[PDB]
Amino acid sequence: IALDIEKAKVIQSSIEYTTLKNVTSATEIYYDPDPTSTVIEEDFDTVEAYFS
Amino acid sequence: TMKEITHAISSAKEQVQEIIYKAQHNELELKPGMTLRESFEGEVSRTLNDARDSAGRSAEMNLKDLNNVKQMVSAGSKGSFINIAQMSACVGQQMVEGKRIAFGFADRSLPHF
Amino acid sequence: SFRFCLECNNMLYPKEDKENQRLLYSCRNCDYTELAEDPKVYRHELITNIGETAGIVDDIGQDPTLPRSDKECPECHSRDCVFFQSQQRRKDTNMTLFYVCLNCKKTFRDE
Ligand SMILES: [Zn+2]
Ligand SMILES: [Zn+2]
């Protein structure tokens, strides 16, 4: 690992601390009274694909 | 030698201008573990330090053996290379708290800029 | 953005009906209740870019301490302009420039 850069980078990634807040960009709260469907149109396709 | 020193300082200032343009167009490489502003400041400071060292080296190479400052520096009794550089070629960059002169006014160092 | 009560000017907190399954903005100081238009109750930006270009005034061309360039205006193609960096002053802030024309007074970049 000391003479190889890729394995060293793998070890570095495995050591460094990473929280959810680091990768998160924005969080939102929405009102949706239908458990099996949704009001948002952008995500409607993906969630209906999941449920089906 | 004064022509050579002036050319070195002008080339360094042109290099600093290029670094400024690159940082102002998002074309600057970021030193790991440091922000964009910190990397820009460090790179400009390194360029200016290299400029002063090059000008001083030119000035110190110019000196004859009969030069008295050279004789004192070569004896090791008083003075060094930086003294010759600042006396003859360039004083260099002034650092306050390990950084260049801050913006004590509103986004400038003096009301003349 | 949050709305205010139309009768006693207090804040309209969101409320949910168990029987009707609707989102309603209701004032807690009275019985007023108005139907909500959007379900976006709350939004938090961990990394935000607001205030970077929001610090702009219409009289910035009269400041004599600002540098003057000759960049081309995208709208009226003027030959004089005034530039400055980002008004946000965090440590992560970019060093990009914002140019202001002396005729249309709009803010535009160089990219
Ligand atoms: Zn009310
Ligand atoms: Zn214009």
CATH number at residue C82: 2.20.25.10
Q: What's the angle, vertex CA B35, arms to CA B33 and CA B91, rounded to 5? A: 100
What are the b/e assignments for C29-40, b being 16+ CB within 10 Å? eeeeeeebeebe
The DSSP letter of residue C107 is E
Whether residue C49 sits in one domain with residue C38: no
N residues, chain B = 113
Task: Say how many residues make up chain A.
Answer: 52
Instruction: Please indicate, yes or no, whether residues C61 and C106 belong to a single structural domain of this protein.
Output: yes
C81 is in an annotated binding site: no
Buried b (16+ CB within 10 A) or exposed e, B9-40: beebeebbeebeeebbeeebeeeeeeebeebb
Alpha carbon of residue C45 to chain centroid: 14
Query: Do C72 and C65 meet the contact criterion of CB atoms below 8 Å apart?
Result: no
Please list every residue in chain A followed by a chain break, i.e. its C lies more than 2.5 Å from the next written N. none
Q: Is B53 helix (H, G, I), strand (E, B) or coil?
A: helix
Domains: count for chain C: 2
Among partner residues A26, A33, A39, which is closest to C45 by beta-carbon distance? A26
My answer on whether C18 and C68 are in the same domain is no
B30 residue type, one letter: L
* Residue C7 in marked binding region: yes
Question: What DSSP line would sit under B55-95, residue for residue?
Answer: HHHHHHHH--SS-HHHHHHHHTSS--HHHHHHHHT------
* C39 plus C50 within the same structural domain: no
d(CA A35, CA C111): 45
**What count of other Cβ atoms lies within 10 Å of the Cβ of residue B94?**
7
Q: Is residue B40 within 8 angstroms of chain C, CB to CB?
A: yes
Dihedral, CA atoms, C60, C64, C65, C66, nearest 10 degrees? 50
* Residue C28 CA from chain centroid, whole number: 29
- Say if residue C50 is in the same domain as residue C39: no
Q: How far apart are CA C66 and CA B107, in angstroms?
A: 10
Rg of the Cα atoms in chain C: 22
Q: How far apart are CA C58 and CA C35, in angstroms?
A: 38
Contact C60, C66 (CB under 8 A): yes
Point out the residue among C21, C42, C43 whose CB comes nearest to the CB of A33. Answer: C21
CB-based contact, A1 to chain C, within 8 Å? no
- For residues C85 and C56, membership in a common domain is answered with yes
Distance between CA atoms of residues C65 and B33, nearest Å:
35
Residue A46, number of CB atoms within 10 A of its CB: 11
Q: How far apart are CA B23 and CA A35, in angstroms?
A: 50
If asked whether residues C17 and C54 sit together in one domain, one would say no
Tell me the CA distances in angstroms from B83 to A15, B46, B64, B98, one per residue in order.
48, 20, 16, 20
Q: Report the distance separating Cα C57 and Cα C106, nearest Å.
A: 10
What tokens appear for C50 in the block?
Answer: 């607001």
The span from the CA of A19 to the CA of B77, in Å, is 59
Q: Is B52 exposed, middle or buried (0-12, 13-18, 19+ CB in 10 A)?
A: buried
Burial tier of A5 (Cβ tally within 10 Å: 0-12, 13-18, 19+): exposed
- Positive or negative, the CA dihedral B70, B74, B79, B84 is positive
DSSP code at position B99: B
The reply to whether C55 and C39 lie within a common domain is no
Contacts of B5 (CB under 8 A, 6+ apart): B55, B58, B59, B89, B90
In a shared domain, residues C54 and C5: no
In this structure, the answer to whether residues C24 and C78 fall within a common structural domain is no
Bridge partners (DSSP) of residue C40 are A30
| Domain match, C85 and C31 both | no
- Chain mean position to CA C82: 22
Cβ within 8 Å of B, C 39-68? 65
DSSP state of C60: G
Residue of B nearest to C67 (CA): B113
At B101, phi and psi to the nearest 5? -60, 130
* CA–CA dist B108, C37 (Å, integer): 48
Q: Residue C108 in contact with residue C77, Cβ under 8 Å? A: no
**And the tokens for B42?**
């460090």
Could you tell me the residue range of the domain that residue C40 belongs to?
A: 1-44
Query: According to the entry, how was the structure determined?
Result: cryo-EM
Q: How far apart are CA B95 and CA B101, in angstroms?
A: 6
Q: Which residues pair with A27 in a beta bridge?
A: C44
CA distance linking residue C97 with residue B75, whole number of Å: 53
Is residue C73 part of an annotated ligand binding site?
Answer: yes
In order, the DSSP letters of B18-50 are HHHHHHTTT-PPPPTTS-HHHHHHHHHHHHHHH
Q: SS3 of B92, please?
A: coil
Can you say whether residue B92 is alpha, beta or left, with left for phi > 0 and alpha for psi between -120 and 50 degrees? Answer: left
* Domain identity same for C31 and C59: no
